[PDB]
Amino acid sequence: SGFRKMAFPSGKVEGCMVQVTCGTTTLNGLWLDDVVYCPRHVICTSEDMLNPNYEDLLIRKSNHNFLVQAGNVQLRVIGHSMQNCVLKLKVDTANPKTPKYKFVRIQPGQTFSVLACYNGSPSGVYQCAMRPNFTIKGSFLNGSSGSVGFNIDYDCVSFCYMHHMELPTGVHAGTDLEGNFYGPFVDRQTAQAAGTDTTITVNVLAWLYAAVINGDRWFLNRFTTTLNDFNLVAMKYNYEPLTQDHVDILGPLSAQTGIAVLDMCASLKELLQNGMNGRTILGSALLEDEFTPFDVVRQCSGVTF
Amino acid sequence: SGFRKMAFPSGKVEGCMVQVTCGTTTLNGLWLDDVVYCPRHVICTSEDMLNPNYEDLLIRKSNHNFLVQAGNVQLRVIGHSMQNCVLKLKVDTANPKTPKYKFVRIQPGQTFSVLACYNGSPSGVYQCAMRPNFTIKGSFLNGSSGSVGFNIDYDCVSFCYMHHMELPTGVHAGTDLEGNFYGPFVDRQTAQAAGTDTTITVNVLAWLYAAVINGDRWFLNRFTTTLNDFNLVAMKYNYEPLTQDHVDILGPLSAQTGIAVLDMCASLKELLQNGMNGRTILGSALLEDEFTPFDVVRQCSGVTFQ
Numbered sequence: 329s330g331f332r333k334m335a336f337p338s339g340k341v342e343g344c345m346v347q348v349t350c351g352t353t354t355l356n357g358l359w360l361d362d363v364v365y366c367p368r369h370v371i372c373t374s375e376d377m378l379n380p381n382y383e384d385l386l387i388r389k390s391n392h393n394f395l396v397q398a399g400n401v402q403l404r405v406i407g408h409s410m411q412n413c414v415l416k417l418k419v420d421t422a423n424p425k426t427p428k429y430k431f432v433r434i435q436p437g438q439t440f441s442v443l444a445c446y447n448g449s450p451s452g453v454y455q456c457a458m459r460p461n462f463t464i465k466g467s468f469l470n471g472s473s474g475s476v477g478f479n480i481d482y483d484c485v486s487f488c489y490m491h492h493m494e495l496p497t498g499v500h501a502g503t504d505l506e507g508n509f510y511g512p513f514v515d516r517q518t519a520q521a522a523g524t525d526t527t528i529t530v531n532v533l534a535w536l537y538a539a540v541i542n543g544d545r546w547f548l549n550r551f552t553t554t555l556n557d558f559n560l561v562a563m564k565y566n567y568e569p570l571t572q573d574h575v576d577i578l579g580p581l582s583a584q585t586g587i588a589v590l591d592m593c594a595s596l597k598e599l600l601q602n603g604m605n606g607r608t609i610l611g612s613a614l615l616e617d618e619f620t621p622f623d624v625v626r627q628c629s630g631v632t633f
Numbered sequence: 634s635g636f637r638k639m640a641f642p643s644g645k646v647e648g649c650m651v652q653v654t655c656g657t658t659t660l661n662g663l664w665l666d667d668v669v670y671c672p673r674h675v676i677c678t679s680e681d682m683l684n685p686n687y688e689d690l691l692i693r694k695s696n697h698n699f700l701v702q703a704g705n706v707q708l709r710v711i712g713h714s715m716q717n718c719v720l721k722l723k724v725d726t727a728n729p730k731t732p733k734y735k736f737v738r739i740q741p742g743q744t745f746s747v748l749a750c751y752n753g754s755p756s757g758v759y760q761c762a763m764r765p766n767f768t769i770k771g772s773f774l775n776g777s778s779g780s781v782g783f784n785i786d787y788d789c790v791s792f793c794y795m796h797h798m799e800l801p802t803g804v805h806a807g808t809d810l811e812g813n814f815y816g817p818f819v820d821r822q823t824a825q826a827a828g829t830d831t832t833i834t835v836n837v838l839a840w841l842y843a844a845v846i847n848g849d850r851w852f853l854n855r856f857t858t859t860l861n862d863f864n865l866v867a868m869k870y871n872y873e874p875l876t877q878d879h880v881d882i883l884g885p886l887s888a889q890t891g892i893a894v895l896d897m898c899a900s901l902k903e904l905l906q907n908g909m910n911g912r913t914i915l916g917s918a919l920l921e922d923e924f925t926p927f928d929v930v931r932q933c934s935g936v937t938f939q
Binding site: 329330331332333334335336337338339340342343443444450451452453454455456465466467468469470494498499500606608611612613614626627628630631632633 | 634635636637638639640641642643644647648748749750751752754755756757758759770771772773774776777799803804805847848908913916917918919931932933935
């Protein structure tokens with residue numbers, strides 16, 4: 329019993345984190361076999377970040393310009409190649425602790441654990457979500473760019489994110505490990521801003537299902553909605569559309585509790601209209617939206633890796 | 634910027650986790666060097682549990698009665714002793730991933746990371762506080778006993794909690810890694826019940842400070858209070874007494890932000906009396922009490938000018 333914001337076991341990712349210096353600029357890198365990925369903005373300095381020519385700055389740079397450290401040990405860079413917004417430094421040594429991995433691009437509303445690093449040194453792990461506006465509300469200080477977010481999908485670490493920059497609102501943008509940014513953001517100091525954030529409806533419903541599983545029934549009601557009308561109400565509370573796809577990934581939880589998804593949408597309809605009125609669900613006074621359906625299943629079945 | 638419930642990385646602990654089976658009971662062990670620590674209730678059938686005598690049950694066991702597994706690989710048990718409520722199984726191999734480590738008993742209010750495991754494999758990691766009534770509000774299912782809490786100081790893992798059992802209220806009870814229970818709890822099947830739970834007052838303040846550090850100020854005020862007039866209002870809202878030991882650890886956060894502890898205590902007093910009034914602090918509608926001052930410094934602190 330109980331329900332917590334649970335992070336993935338960060339073990340198999342801690343072995344992959346390294347330091348990458350270039351000038352006086354230090355950030356973090358991900359070491360997988362004989363390649364070290366990091367933000368291409370390690371090459372820039374403070375002037376260049378105002379308006380960078382990455383293709384002309386990587387020219388005036390050679391292998392010896394990149395210092396790469398793995399604990400006490402040093403690593404020898406035997407090539408480079410900037411793909412999109414991420415650097416891939418070929419190095420002479422394969423990481424012994426390289427796990428079975430893949431590179432994924434996640435859709436908004438999908439969650440992942442973030443391993444916050446400084447100086448190639450993991451400091452903490454937390455569970456995050458890709459906001460609808462393609463940011464994440466992370467916890468990052470100066471020098472954490474290159475820290476990575478990930479899932480464990482069965483036996484295989486799925487790298488989904490690499491931190492680049494902090495936007496002015498306090499939120500955070502980055503790339504997949506192919507270097508292609510999430511959202512409209514770009515690696516340069518300009519007047520970028522995040523959109524307005526909205527709530528990830530399908531995750532809220534997942535969490536209401538968790539609450540039912542763990543014994544909370546008060547928010548349930550005989551009322552009934554259609555998919556269309558729910559979205560009309562929800563939309564005025566900054567809730568993301570619930571699609572027919574969404575209604576399917578909720579079908580497992582629908583059948584474990586015998587509550588149709590549309591009946592749960594009616595429960596959520598009334599919580600939006602009437603509020604919560606100083607009541608808690610699963611130790612919470614707000615509607616949590618950072619647990620996916622699969623996150624619920626995992627915590628409630630005791631899924632291991 | 635930002636502020637999350639941040640767990641310590643769990644790798645150093647992942648490499649220690651093993652599966653311990655005895656009879657029909659399977660649970661988790663901790664493989665440090667050539668010893669496996671696990672809860673001693675693994676040797677009980679549920680008929681003994683009703684009123685067991687543990688040194689009597691342990692002297693009936695053979696080494697071969699313990700199935701210990703690390704991955705596919707069975708470990709050979711060569712000895713078995715008790716220390717309070719934990720079994721030390723001597724195995725024949727030393728754990729090659731054994732981190733630098735140490736066993737520490739924590740106090741109520743302090744926090745730690747928990748690696749929830751089943752069958753010696755980890756399910757995930759989360760931060761917890763030792764509640765003042767010596768329970769924890771974990772997420773633990775059947776098979777989770779043997780899971781451990783831990784803090785990490787540099788390279789060094791300070792194991793502080795081992796999970797044993799779930800109480801009727803759905804909170805969790807366990808021991809330090811020397812076998813002594815946190816709280817008045819016993820590993821036999823009796824009526825047991827958690828004492829009254831209260832809010833860790835020092836921790837809330839640490840979190841109001843973390844809020845001010847992240848640019849929330851809406852809940853501050855010019856009002857100031859005596860420590861005693863606070864506790865008078867606080868106690869009636871189910872809060873722990875605040876005391877100089879607490880004030881003197883907030884000191885750095887009170888200094889980094891410029892807000893005298895006694896002023897932060899007048900902010901909280903007003904939050905208690907008037908409620909939050911449809912507002913949020915660090916994305917929360919409740920006052921959070923599972924962040925210690927140290928978890929705040931850990932997470933959102935930098936260079937200070939002298």
